[PDB]
Amino acid sequence: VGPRLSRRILQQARQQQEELEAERERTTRLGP
Amino acid sequence: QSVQVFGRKKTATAVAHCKRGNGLIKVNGRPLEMIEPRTLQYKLLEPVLLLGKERFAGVDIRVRVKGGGHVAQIYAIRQSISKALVAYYQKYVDEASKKEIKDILIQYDRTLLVADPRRCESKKF
Amino acid sequence: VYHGLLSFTVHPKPKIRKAAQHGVCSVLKGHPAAISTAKFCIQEIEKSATTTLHMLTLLKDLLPCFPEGLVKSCSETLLRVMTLSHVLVTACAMQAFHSLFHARPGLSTLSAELNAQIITALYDYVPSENDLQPLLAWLKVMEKAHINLVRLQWDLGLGHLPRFFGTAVTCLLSPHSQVLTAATQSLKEILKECVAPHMADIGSVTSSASGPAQSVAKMF
RNA sequence: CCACCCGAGAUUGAGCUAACAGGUCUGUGAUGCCCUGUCCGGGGCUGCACGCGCGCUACACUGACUGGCUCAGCGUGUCCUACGCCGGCAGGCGCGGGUAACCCGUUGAACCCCAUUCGUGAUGGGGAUCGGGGAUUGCAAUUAUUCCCC
């Protein structure tokens, strides 16, 4: 394929994997 | 069980994920039958019409498409769906159906499974 | 007299402020007065924006010589100012965490349960994926905290290691080369100093391990 | 690279500093030749009967207008810009990010696609040339800098 198009394909497939895996405040205190 | 394939055109890329399902086709989260240019609608719909809706009745696919223009995106999508079905019937279904289906696609159109390696030429000083 | 010396840190002139800061650091490192200055720093942060970095520099230079409850309260206030999105306060307080965990404090200053709690609390930020100024500090302070936790209680540290190793492996997908080298160096340091000498104690691990051997299998 | 075994020899003798077409620097020839401008203000830099050529926009119906829908890449950036408010528009104010695969930016581009108006009409094609006003960059826009509205 070549560098640029394969790079776009790889990142696109990675984003599709993450959106398949997808389907609160920070811990402000140390002790409960 | 699921597979993930890709198809391409000049710059347009389509990544297709193929999972066990019931026969709903998603491209960019949108259904197959609503992609903007209707004049190329059958160009989007050729694998289903050649193979029949009964071969798609036990599977679902989602395609993310990036790059290119309208027509290049359509061609990358149809390459992606054809390669996704070929990969699925190769990996989790018996090989004879995969070979006969691959023969049907390649006798109708080579670009359904083989990428067209044409791109814009560069201009040199 | 200590309060009078301490009150001139927030004085806006750099020559007055730097002299007061260095004097307080020399007095504490040369302690019954640690509680008072820790409470003063906590109240000075809670009152306030450019002086925040100043008593954060105080906290960076003075965290190891503090009692455990005051360390806990200081870290709670520090995560409270981590709720803000300001960058300089984040970098300076990560430097404060680096100075806190780098000195390897004793059990009186820092306990193992407190270290585990602050390790679990620090997982919530991980700036995005590719920021490379705060992610470096975040990896470094988590490395030092894990080293200190293993030094205090080794089995709990090895138990908490697989999550950090998984996040480091995920962070190895960043396009920056420096964060990749830093993650490799950090995991190498943890493997050499915190994982290797305890393997005679752990013994052989199979697919059905239970204790720290299962954690070793998980980070493998 | 070091040391050592074997081996006659794991290095014993001869010949070769040099070079400046890159030059530089206050010197040497009563050295050959040829002679005895600066700052300042204003204007013009194609002003246009014409000849010879590059280009841009069109002569419309495979089109113009209005709305809707939906897709790039090479680059560049302490001037690129996100966002909030005001104005109908150019534009104005404030507040953030970016010395950068981190922010503009998932670069929501145009042709294209889908509906409306138009109907062979120098006409809703085509925009030149003008009249009025606003805004912006500059010390300064007059002989129209550039943009916007009618």
Percent helix range of chain B: 25-40%
Oligomer: part of a larger assembly
Greatest chain-chain contact: A-B, 10 and 11 residues
Q: From N to C, what is the helix and strand string of chain B?
A: EEEEHEHH
Largest sheet of chain B: 5 strands, mixed
Gross morphology of chain B is: globular
Distance between the termini of chain C: 56 Å
Could you spell the SSE succession of chain C in H and E letters?
A: HHHHHHHHHHHH
* Total domain count of chain B: 1
The proportion of residues in beta strands of chain B is 15-25%
Number of helices of chain B: 3
N-end to C-end Cα span of chain B? 52 Å
The number of distinct helices of chain C, counting runs of at least 4 residues, comes to 12
Proportion of residues in helical segments of chain C: over 70%
Structural write-up:
Chain A: It is found in: Cytoplasm; Nucleus, Nucleolus. The structure is cut from a larger assembly and holds chains A (32 residues), B (125 residues) and C (220 residues). In chain A, 62% of the residues lie in helices and 0% in strands. With 32 residues, chain A is mostly helical. By secondary structure, chain B is of the alpha+beta class. A five-stranded mixed sheet of chain B has the order 1-2-5-3-4. In chain B, strand 1 (2-8) and strand 2 form a beta hairpin. The radius of gyration of chain B is 15 Å and the shape is globular. Chain C has 220 residues and is mainly alpha-helical. Chain C has twelve helices and no strands. In chain C, helix 6 (87-102) packs parallel to helix 8 (134-152). Chain C is globular. Chains A and B meet through helix 1 of A and strand 1, strand 2 and strand 5 of B. Chain B binds one RNA strand of 150 nucleotides through helix 2.
Which short descriptors sum up this protein?
part of a larger assembly; 3 chains; A: 32 residues; mainly alpha; 1 helix; B: 125 residues; alpha+beta; five-stranded mixed beta sheet; 3 helices; RNA-binding
Set out the fold topology.
The structure is cut from a larger assembly and holds chains A (32 residues), B (125 residues) and C (220 residues).
Chain A lengths: L2 H20 L10
Chain B lengths: L1 E7 L4 E8 L4 E3 L2 E2 L9 H11 L7 E8 L3 H22 L3 H14 L17
Parallel strand pairs in B: 3-5
Antiparallel strand pairs in B: 1-2, 2-5, 3-4
Helix pairs in contact in B: 1-2, 2-3
Chain C lengths: L1 H5 L7 H15 L5 H14 L3 H12 L5 H15 L4 H16 L9 H10 L12 H19 L1 H18 L5 H19 L3 H4 L9 H8 L1
Helix pairs in contact in C: 2-4, 3-4, 3-5, 4-6, 6-8, 7-8, 8-9, 8-10, 9-10, 9-12
The structure holds one RNA strand of 150 nucleotides.
